[PDB]
Amino acid sequence: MKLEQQIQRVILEEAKALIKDYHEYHNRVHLESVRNKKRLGDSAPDKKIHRPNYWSFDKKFDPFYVKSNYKSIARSIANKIENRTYLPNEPFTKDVPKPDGGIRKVSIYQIPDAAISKLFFNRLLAKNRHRFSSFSYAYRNDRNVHFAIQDISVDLKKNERTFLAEFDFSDFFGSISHSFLNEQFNENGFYISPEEKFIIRSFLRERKVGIPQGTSISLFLANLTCWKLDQDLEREGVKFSRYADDTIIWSQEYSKICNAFNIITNFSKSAGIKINPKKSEGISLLTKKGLPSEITSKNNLDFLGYTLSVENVSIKEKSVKKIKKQISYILYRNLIQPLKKTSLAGQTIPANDRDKNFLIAICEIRRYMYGGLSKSQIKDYLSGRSNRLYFKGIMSFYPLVNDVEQLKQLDGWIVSVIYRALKLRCQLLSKWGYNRSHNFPFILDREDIVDKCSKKTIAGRKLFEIPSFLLIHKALQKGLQESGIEKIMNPQ
Amino acid sequence: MKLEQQIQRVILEEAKALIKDYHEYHNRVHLESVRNKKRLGDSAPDKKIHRPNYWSFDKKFDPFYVKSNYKSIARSIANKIENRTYLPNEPFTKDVPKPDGGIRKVSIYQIPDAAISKLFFNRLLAKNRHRFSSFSYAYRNDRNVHFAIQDISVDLKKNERTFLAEFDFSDFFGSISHSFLNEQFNENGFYISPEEKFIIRSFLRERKVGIPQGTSISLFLANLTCWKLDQDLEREGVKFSRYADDTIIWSQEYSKICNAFNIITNFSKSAGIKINPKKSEGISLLTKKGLPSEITSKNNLDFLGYTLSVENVSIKEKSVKKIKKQISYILYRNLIQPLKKTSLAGQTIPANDRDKNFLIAICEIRRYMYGGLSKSQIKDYLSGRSNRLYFKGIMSFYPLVNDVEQLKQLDGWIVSVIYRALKLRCQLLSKWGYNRSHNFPFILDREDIVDKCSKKTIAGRKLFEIPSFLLIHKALQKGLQESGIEKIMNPQ
Amino acid sequence: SQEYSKICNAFNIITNFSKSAGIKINPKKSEGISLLTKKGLPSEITSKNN
RNA sequence: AUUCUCUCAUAGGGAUAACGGUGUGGCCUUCUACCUGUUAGAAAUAAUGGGUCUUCAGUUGUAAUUCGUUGCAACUGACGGGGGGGUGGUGUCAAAGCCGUUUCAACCAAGUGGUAACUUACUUUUACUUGGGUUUAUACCGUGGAA
RNA sequence: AUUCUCUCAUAGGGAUAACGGUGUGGCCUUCUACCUGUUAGAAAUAAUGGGUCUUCAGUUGUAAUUCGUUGCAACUGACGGGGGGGUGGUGUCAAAGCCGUUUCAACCAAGUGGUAACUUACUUUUACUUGGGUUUAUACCGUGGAA
């Protein structure tokens, strides 16, 4: 087919995606407003509906208007791409620096330009994916972080002490030399058509150095420049794994890991990229616990939310603290916050050994960790009674974790936090003039919360059971050997 | 879905494929019989239709009977796979030794067993393709011979002299140790379910050593055993490319290529495979023409139908001789063979400057080399007037050839052979009593055959033009940079 | 030995033999890799005199 | 109008008012061990209502082997953090320590110079919600029309 | 029966005779520079019939640059093997050589001790045929039924 049919179909799909997202967004907002009213009573605020503020800067940002007039835009763009006159329109770049983080300025392009960028990125990736290295895991459709994690986990067990080099790059996207970039189009066996070359050069006219962020065409150019670095790194004879601008190298020889520094420095001098000397760790020796070392040594390393070691693979401390933050905020929101207002008009007071708020908080925690599964369904999957199960929780993002002790400590932390939150709720209810210290669940003790909640039934469903990380860990371990990583892992 | 639906669908597709092939086969036979009658006149033999002789050995070989009764076979097999009682039936192995070739005994299995083998091979390949090396090109759906050819062609240009090691293995499939094979299922991070282990072991019960040939389940086991060999070969720091049991290694260091021999020997001792000392070439130094060498040296090497060198990539001599064989036989069949019979009853004698046999031979040659394209369509593709063209000829099997001189010599050989065949046809027609030495095309000379045939028209189509390899080479070169290798290459 | 790489390879040989024979080394009575020099000479890594 | 047209087609002109989604219910079919109530009615079966179990490592004693690890009874071992105060053991020449009872803390806090708040929130690889499909049953959410 | 059923389901029982494909034509739509005949009829356009062109490297002289390589006239260089005999050049002190005319060979054969045959053929990575789709137009090919 001609280029105009492809532009028309890509533009139509892109336009319909934003409309679907907006239609789901305002319905979620209405449902959450209704539940907030039922929770806060008469103290709930009013519902507010917002629209993107950049939809009014230029008419072409609005997906409804783009969809209404897509055939003419297609026609025009096609003609100007066949007349060598096309030029992307200036983007909207409101991104600004954030505390403790890089500015990370990101540009948002209009729908026709982003559609052209994605269309021309897909064909280049399809034509040239077979000439990339097997140790690059970013911006591709056949590799993912979990493959690098599995490769490092498998390789580190074999030996007892290995050397490691960790280095970082400063301003990766904004420091690529244009004369360098243009010289790689005729090397390593790549296939770039003249029209594709034109389209690529059309996106760099405004700048004098670096490549734009926020667009899909720069993700191929990001992997294009490191082909010689990966070629020389593999020729050296050391193992490595690179994701975007973050890399790690390990080897058994000091001389080999010293030569890897010279290779990295030579590539940085060739491409004009300067390394950051404040976020780099350098050369260190990783050994098992208790073994002495002659040089600077460490026991574990962090890589993309994981904590690799000689023995086990665990979750990073920052991600653990964010899980604790979300669970604690859910309990505080559903138990303590409503009772701190000026008046209790429209609220509901627990009575007759019933508490809807505790059930709601438990259900929300179960939806946050499991995703809605029950312990009976999990045990049916484990016993082989059933042969189908879905993974849609937070644990789906860390399927390679095999550290039981950390999960046990998280379970004990959850139980203690729940007990103390219920104690504070009881004290606040006593302060308001209601005494419910002899009713469920305020009467339960810490040592019997799980056992007593494991029995209470409602409508034939055990809706009061406390989720455990160990059970879902066992289910993930069983499903990994029967379906694979790609199937088990989350789609995002 | 359950296992029975998958078995039912796979069996049905396999059964319908043979029926489609047979229905196309007997129609091709009838058409060829009609044309043979019109060509040989009254001396043509009678049409004969055959059936596979092994269809009567066991009813289950017949696809019509299998299709008629597929649901019961599905049911049964499923039940016995869920009761741990399944066992493949003995195959039919009529393959025998051939002169100048290995016996290569091949077993044909029945449809349900081959369907189970393919079904269980597909899921294993999907679950474990990400743990294979990037330099293995056999029995996969993401790598092909042409990728290895492009990698060697690109790498050899950079340097002027490299060392090479070429070695071969004797009886690869029939010498794998079972105790070795069973020990690799728990290493390198593989994922094999217990049911899959059962199915695998079910196909090796009869033998005491080696794996069966002719089935789809052994193609995964072929790539499974060489994981440690490829791991150590990549750890050494040398380049290589392995396809099935054939491998090549090249490097810049004598010590590195000497260590590659020790790695190969250690792997052969570990797996029990013995190398053949009569089909191996050893260690040689490849240099450019005219440069002296201190050790045994050569100028080019052969790999999978190609002839690689420092400068160019050409076609192997054996494939060139087979192309010449096919062209010469086509000309002999359509020009000389009919006139050597006892009587010319029912034949047609050329007259009034007309010759249907010459036109038929030219059309068959064009279909053999191009596939039916015309020089006007090719020049339209080259000039950019059109933007779509198909490649369905013999040249589609060698798209990376860039040796113009060889194609020019083949063109001159074609012209000379055509001229001499027409001269012999004229002499035979003179011997039968007809003098046509002053009529087209017997009057044309060698130096004007192309120029005169390039003008004659019939029904507005230049059906007498002589095909040239250089034009299709230019079209292949242009299409490679605009669609890619996967798209241009043949589907087989 | 006189070479750091050679004394680093000796560790891999010892570890491979321990894995082959099933013997496990004790990490509390071992001293590791150290450089022995004469008294008064500086060292770049952990050093001892006797 | 987010619906439909028109062409000079990253724009401009007409014509019609509806056009996209969410919750609940329905239907379609879809992977499931038992034991018991009350119904119905022939135990073909249904209909509903209650309760239990599922994992791993062992030690066996044995069958099977296809010469192994297997399948098995029976067995026994696992399987929900940490911190600050008080008070008994038992620790020894002192002691560490090791035992368990009783209190305090919504979380970061096993800490800060000091400790409260927050989810349409906050941010560097950092994000997702419950087998599908179809329902002019049923109630509502953008934006229009009417007013 | 290769069609449909039935269950004890790698099998066995019934019932119906049609069931799968190929060539040609049709239709649907699908990527295409011109110049000319004769038609038709208004040059809106058709309908058919004839003929030419398409690639790469240069040298420019110049415009554009977005500071380059570009786009351009015009230019000139490419673009269909080898072998065995005869005979002229020109080779030089001889000579190699280098020039081109004239004959012989269906291919392997630029070779074998010797050279004919073969495609439903022969064989180690070794194989495929012409944008699709739909046509109870039209003629035929397996296997059934009828006979």
Residue numbers in the entry:
A (entry chain B), B (entry chain D): 1 to 492
C (entry chain C): 251 to 300
From the paper:
Interestingly, after protease cleavage of the N-terminal tag, we observed a shift in the gel filtration retention volume to a monodisperse, higher molecular weight (MW) species, consistent with oligomerization. Following protease cleavage of the affinity tag, we used cryo-EM to determine a 2.6 Å-resolution reconstruction, which revealed a hexameric architecture — a back-to-back dimer of trimers. The hexameric assembly is reminiscent of AbiK16, but the mechanisms of assembly are distinct. Assembly of the AbiK hexamer relies on an alpha-helical repeat domain (i.e., αRep), while assembly of the DRT9 hexamer relies on a combination of RNA-RNA (SL5:SL5.1 and SL4:SL4), RNA-protein, and protein-protein interactions, resulting in a buried surface area of 3,000 Å2 between trimers. Although the structures of the trimer and hexamer are nearly equivalent, the hexamer contains additional density near the active site that is not present in the trimer reconstruction. Notably, the U4 motif (123–126) is positioned ~8 Å from the YADD active site, consistent with a role in templating poly-dA synthesis. Biochemical and structural data demonstrate that a hexameric RT-ncRNA complex polymerizes dATP using a protein primer and poly-uridine template.
Here we show that DRT9 systems are triggered by phage infection to produce long, uninterrupted chains of polydeoxyadenylate (poly-dA). Poly-dA synthesis is primed by tyrosine residues within the RT itself, and is templated by a structured ncRNA containing a universally conserved poly-uridine tract. Our study reveals a mechanism of antiviral immunity mediated by DRT9 defense systems, in which a ncRNA templates the synthesis of long, kilobase-length homopolymers of deoxyadenylate to drive abortive infection.
